[model samples]
Target chain A: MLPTLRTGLVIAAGYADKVRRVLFAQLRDAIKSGELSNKDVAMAAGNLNRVLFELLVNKLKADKLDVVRIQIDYEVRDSQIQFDFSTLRVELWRRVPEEEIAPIVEDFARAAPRLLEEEIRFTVEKVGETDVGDVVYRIMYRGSDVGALIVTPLNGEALVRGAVVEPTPLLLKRTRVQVEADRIDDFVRESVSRLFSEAQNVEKREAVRVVNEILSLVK
Target chain B: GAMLPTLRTGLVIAAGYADKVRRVLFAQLRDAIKSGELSNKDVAMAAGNLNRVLFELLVNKLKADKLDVVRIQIDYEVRDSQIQFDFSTLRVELWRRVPEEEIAPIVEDFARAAPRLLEEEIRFTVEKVGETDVGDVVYRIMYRGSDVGALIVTPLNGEALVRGAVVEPTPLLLKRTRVQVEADRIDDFVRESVSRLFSEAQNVEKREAVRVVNEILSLVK
Candidate 1:
């Protein structure tokens, strides 16, 4: 259906019957499957119920004259909702040497709260100590701790292991911030950003191909 | 505070399949990294394009969701990096084509006249590679990593179904081009839109005509 340079109500005479046949089939199937309903059939800008019934009644007496109500069943598009979802975590797990672990944590603790992307605010505070006396710090997101960093020394290398937590649905919103513990910082920033991203990552939407099928059906 | 014009903006939400595809794409990226096949940069860029046909998917789905929407389209030379995740689009090779010299006057005019207008100064000069019909012109623009604007005159019919990016439909608000009669209908901006749309329509009609002829001929036989 287009306007201008073309006439209104100009039926492609050849296509009319073809379209009418397919439409009837689909409508009947839609009715049978309850995907479409005649329950609302009584009301509409177009009274399909009246038109159809009248055609059926008049067309039945058609040995001499002709009137017709046509109906066909079209195969409904499959509704199984084809799917594939993988929930993978992108985090950091590494061993950091402890020589400057204390100072980095100390400096991190002393610094004021900083904001990532001007939106995520975080603070590194000494939350407790580990079994072997290593200091444990909490990477608090907006006051709630979502990540934890511990400083453990081993064979002259401070073991730096940061367990970064994904942001929750509440913060579903990474990677420009860097510190002496750059990987850890990257982990935290990206994780926090995942608070926003994972929301979309785990988001449920129409399949791209199905979306195309639906679009093809539009016109 | 002013939003710059962008191409290939799309969105997807409340879709389980899209979520899975996201996982698959990210998984492929991770696997590529794991196997040294490709880097963890972006290989899914090409697959995420949206055009008039695809965008109709978004509009129709949103319509099913009972949201107000108008128009569905897909064309080429689209790029957007800052758009919220889930909005998806693709860079595509267009059916329409134009001569290299045909666009020279237009670009030169914009180059000289650009300084005195609401438009940003010309950030691009000549890069014509002779009658181009590649799909990723907008991708190249955005790939430059600068917010540079570009125009292309071809049918480069890519997809632009907003939010068709993933299965997970985010309730994020989306901005659509004004009453999308066509994506390239960058009306008043170029004539390529009409020219392209006509040709595309003709292609469809002509192909259907061939099928009709065959079927009718078969009926006679």
Candidate 2:
């Protein structure tokens, strides 16, 4: 009875890893069919495009000012490409301007990848018009029409009613890393700093601990 | 002002120099802990140097910030201050509750010890040390000095790597007590101290097909 039960359990659990593959694919297909909300899958984490804008602005603006540059370099060697991203490097080069960053980010996100890989034509622009009197634009992708974004006449913002851009498999895998500057530099600096000091806030109560630790050296 | 660039350069150099010092010290410490004939002295030398390197990095950080006053200068000295973080616990000596008026005697003792301390190292255990007005806590060490150095034992995906280096350094610190050294050592001191700063910056040397490429002023030609 014990051997038979153990064998039965193994048979059930054997293909569990592949079972995860099927379930994740079903989620992808369902998301693609547009039966659910476009934001449903992503609403918890929020938009990458918007998040990058705030950080660029915060690092460039909040309690500060002006001029920043980010670069990407690729080198060819023995038919394999090597990448250099060792620097994040913001320079405060005699500059400041505030409050026209909307178009700056919009063009960057929707068009940057398309510039490098011309086939991925995802953008927000005028397609055609029906006046619900809302000046309407479709999120167009290589002329791949997906959904409408509406701008009420003279409005400051455009609303993403359906998909801003299609949730293509390529976008999730490749686009995120390219578009988003990861926080590796921030963590690298922090880790290196700990070589000198501990990662802690100074407080008066720990004076005892500090005093006694001097026994660390030869007395 | 050129102040921004100056400040940036100082901090960068501090970390760079300390990192170089640390890499060599940790290797020495590793062997000392394992088995060397001069095991006790090896542990003392590396730990003392590590202590110095950390202290100097903090000083560089303070110097670059332009504040110029806080913690760097001592109206009240953390006299004979120590800076060490060998394992999980990082301890930087700070000016404790010592009153400013009483700070003179501590400074005077440090002045007397500074020259001799440079030429030699002295150590004592609990039984022979401590008698001062500062009470039982502050041990009144007034003659010690240290420089800027750094160390982190970054393992390669071992459990110890991802976790803190709580165990590797634990053994050495416990074993540290009453180790003596020969006074014939200022040359080794100069060799290890000065050479390490240059070596860390030269990692990319001696590589790849021994190829050569160069250009001189094309305009002159």
Candidate 3:
């Protein structure tokens, strides 16, 4: 039911809003926690932009798209992120009929949220326990370890630290005596979700663009 | 009686230095590509980027060197011609009187040293100025006039300093210069320059540097 076309497909107006939001939130939290200054926020934003791009590319790869070229235009002002979704361009060499283009793009759009959820889910999996007596969890996505999480109980409160390993290894986030011991497990779960959702907002727009492009192509 | 031998030997030394640098660079590029850190597309882009960067570095260094070569050759010409002229006032007079034939060897010496000197000096500067200047230089060099041969002089550092020169048929034969360096050291200047660039990088930058080196290797064949 797809039209026969072999040259290339250009999907425009794709934005990673979810990734941007997540990163911006992380930046805000880091700044508020005294872990980062205003200058540090600027620096972290630059890195976060690249991280968002990489995640987008990885997502495309997950969708089995032969993504030869990807171009994204984004802007950050006053801690709010905006991507020029109209400037988002993705190219693929695989041949698909015009009729099928809509379905394929729609399928990809529908699957994107699920794909991201899967990446987020696997990012915090219990790997083992520490030698001294603490829980150690590996923060990974698609077999690539980004960092690890360690939870240790002190009195009635729990201490949580997420150490990032990719691009560079650093302690991404830490909280002490703030989370109750009884709710420690839930807190860890929420933290992982919060970290992963930073960029999911943008993913929604990207999915929309894919569907729109498919419709236009079919028409 | 011994001037020609000294100049000729100078050329040989320049050529030797170029060869050594070329070998070191080529080894680095080869090893970087083989290291498997960069994807094929990443290698290609890095190669293209570095090719442009090195080309600009070559032109700037060549321009600076050309100025120096002209000055030195003019001085030598005046001395050898047995003309009476004061050092301070003679520059204008010397430029008017010196024969192209007399200055050809000096330019030739620079042409010989172009590859090696550029690799060495830029490597030194990259360390001094950091990678940010690499970006700055790339932009600055892009807009400048390109010339080949005939000894053109440009300003360097401050106050019209002469760094060196080259002998070419055209005002800007970048491709020829590239080929000359390639033939002289089998693409060693690029290899060496890339290697030096890689050594100065860390973390994200280190990865980018490796990608650039790998790209250079893919383009050579």
TM-score of predicted structure 3, chain A: 0.30
Residue B202 error for model 1, in Å? 40
lDDT of each prediction vs. the true structure? 0.28, 0.25, 0.32
The residue-by-residue lDDT of candidate 2 on B1-221, one tens digit each, is 22110001111222233333333344534543465334444433333333233333343322222111111111111112222222212222111122324433433443354334323322211111221232111111111122111111111222111000000000001111121222243223223322232121111111110111010011111
Error of 2 at B7 (Å): 23
The number of the candidate with the highest lDDT is: 3
Model 2: DockQ score = 0.01
Instruction: Specify the highest-DockQ model's number.
Output: 1
lDDT per residue for candidate 2 within A1-219, as digits (tens), equals 110000110111111222223323434654566543333322211111122223333333311122222222323344222223222122222111223323333333343222321223345445433345433444444455533333333232222222221211111111111111233233222322222121121111232233222222212
Stretches of model 2 off by over 4 angstroms after superposition: A1-53, A57-219, B1-28, B37-41, B60-221
Model 1 chain A, poorest ten-residue lDDT window? Answer: A82-91
Please give the C-alpha DockQ score of model 3.
0.00
Candidate 2 CAPRI classification by DockQ = incorrect
Candidate 3 residue-wise lDDT at A203: 19
- Tens digit per residue, CA lDDT, model 1, A7-36: 111111222232233334435655677664
